């Protein structure tokens, strides 16, 4: 039962289907009256550690086949020739088979990196004309699509298996074996925790794990002449595969009662999603003054919900794309949303997303159509999705029937109160405590109309000039901004 | 005349054209002075029960040909060799014919599951240099485009006939033999039903059936050691007589359409202001018809498409409707297909023309079809001049009285007797105006609040959607 991290459900099924039909002795097969499977093929993303699995599986099936290995080129040697060779490794098995056919000979052949003559030659040997059973062949390849259709068909390669990147629990299994090997000998790093490593990594192919640990070992070697694992997390991948930290640079500071009302309302919306059998799709939008901080809030709502799949959609990625191309990427995101039973998606800068321009007005029809249809569009029954839109300008959106589409509308107004502004200032903690008092003295009797994004920028702008200057400059700046 | 279910029309024409000119004895070919057809070709979709049909045709042509079977690979053995084989099977027919050429020998050869030298080699055998007539070869294949160019033209394979999309019945037959084998053995699965199995799968090739069976055997082995429903998940309430009345009027349109020859087409238009539930009502109308082919087209299916592509989809669906004797077609989000935007105006004209023209257009004689559309903006549509094109106008309205409201809350059964007792006490006598779906939404928006904040939140929502 060792060793292979994760892939136990998949392993159990695959194992059962290929091996069990062979294993039952001996009447069971005739009672079934079903011919033995010819081959099993596994296709995986690179770094999924296919080879070890194949050697192990082959080893597991027979005491000794004993294993046959084929070079990747396969058809090397021009004169005759290679075709004959492709015929030949099969040929040994078939010879054994003609010599003993009935019972009990098994040969294991594996093809790594699986046109003209070779397609037919292999296809002919694996199935037909007569017999050719009592042997199995496994092909390991990075891409399914590359491979030939004929093999795919039931028969010669009836079953094709796809290996997902290891699960967090699975990831824990792969890390767990290397860690365990390190565990058995006395030396270890106390700081490192298996659970912590597992929670930290979602994306990684197997390979990634052995690689990171090995690299950590190298850093440790360097040390001799968290810890090393933490350093590997810091660098090593290169993983190749949702950052909220890029959308909440600045904190959901509790500047105001409005912040709380919007968030509690967000909780009402997630709660609303949780069941929602009567209504499948959840649509929410945020309408705010520019520099509203609406997007920080939306990102925070997505983080708070923690639905199994939450993916941000970004305006920034769309830039410079053909309008049709913009639609295409967008649709692609939409289908990606489908897989989770419960799911959250973000629409940001919709005025920007649309490519809407105030003069004209001139705007992109196709993007608008994708947006318009999806809220009406229904995810398959069972699986569900919630939609969040951030809009700088409300009226235009109302105008394109977009408002009509959304289930709920929320407002996140700029603070109109000097004291709330003061509270926000305290939360940001930038200027000194004398300054806090002076600002507090100035705000009373005055009305403030400024966005938080704008506000952070304003504070920062006032700060660079010298201390006597900062109070006056900031007040004057506020006056101008007003 | 047996056995092949359906495919009597295609069969009748095909048998006649290939077989009748040869069959007629004997002055007829000369009196006609027309050369016998070299071959007949059929191209078909997977799961069509092809092998049996080919067997039947070959059997039908001669008392005994007697049948020639060609292996799928055909050309196996590169070295000499294959070329000799491809030339050779033809060669035998040629030998018999040269030996007796004049009258009266016919040989039938069939190649299953269809370049360089072989292209020319086959063309040469089928036609020329001299004669090579008095034999026929039929090729049956899943995809048209793959096969060679030289062939299509009148002559070697002058007529190519395409079978209609595969009958389930055959699929049921191929499955039926394997199922029968399991029936035959004592062992069987209670859960498997021939009817269920046939109904779930459409696309699949023959091959696929025995394959599925192998998989079922494997599962047993493991043990020993176009949807109507999805579209309308909610189902339909009947709060008001108008609501019943639209279904009755719709049913009447269907009756008219199916029963009467005089109008090939009727156009069904639903007038509602969104968020109306009318789209659903239209789908329902289609369901009640029980028409042989009813297809509902969804904009999302067309989402992100270029104008031309949407139009092509429309053409495909509608053309699909033409082939059937009669059909019901439901059109949804008519504004969206149009891509009307109130600003502008911006809309796609080309689509407007395709739909509007087709709407006037009628299928070839002996067939009739029914078109149903959902429109947000009857006024805007009339402004286009498209509304005039539609045969009939039907209007579906949002609730207007407190009474329709409680009847709906009751039919849905979400709120308590108490809840409904408070709501009625807050609406009865007053005036309301809210579409059905938002209501179904607000309902969910109120169940999210605590058991005591539900009434207030509900009434708050209804206070906003005014
Ligand atoms: N989940 C995993 N299980 C087992 N081995 C893994 C896993 N992830 C990575 N590996 C590593 O990968 C090796 C075997 O998988 P391998 O990388 O060969 O798969 P692959 O599909 O051939 O990858 P590639 O396509 O990049 O060559 C092992 O040496 C192991 O260290
Ligand atoms: N809950 C929160 N949400 C968003 N931003 C917050 C929060 N707490 C603090 N901030 C800070 O407030 C500002 C967020 O404004 P942001 O620019 O993200 O809004 P926006 O939608 O981009 O406005 P606009 O689109 O009009 O530029 C940043 O300084 C951010 O780091
Ligand atoms: N009494 C009712 N009549 C019609 N539909 C109802 C009723 N009660 C609930 N529904 C449901 O309300 C939902 C409305 O769905 P649908 O999108 O078809 O409405 P629609 O009018 O097409 O919306 P739109 O106006 O955006 O086109 C469906 O789940 C439908 O089954």
From Swiss-Prot, chain B:
It is an enzyme of class 3 (hydrolase). It comes from the Eukaryota. GO terms for molecular function: ATP binding; ATP hydrolysis activity; ATP-dependent protein disaggregase activity; identical protein binding; ionotropic glutamate receptor binding; metal ion binding; PDZ domain binding; protein kinase binding. The modification Phosphotyrosine is found at residue 43. One of its GO terms (biological process) is intracellular protein transport. Mg(2+) binds at residue 279. Coiled coil: none annotated. This is Vesicle-fusing ATPase. Homohexamer. Interacts with GABARAP and GABARAPL2. Interacts with GRIA2. Interacts with PLK2, leading to disrupt the interaction with GRIA2. Interacts with MUSK; may regulate MUSK endocytosis and activity. Interacts with CDK16. The gene is NSF. Keywords: Acetylation, ATP-binding, Cytoplasm, Hydrolase, Magnesium, Metal-binding, Nucleotide-binding, Phosphoprotein, Protein transport, Repeat, Transport. Binds 1 Mg(2+) ion per subunit. It is found in: Cytoplasm. ATP binds at residues 234-239, 274-281. Its EC number is 3.6.4.6. It catalyses: ATP + H2O = ADP + phosphate + H(+). Belongs to the AAA ATPase family. Transmembrane segments: none annotated.
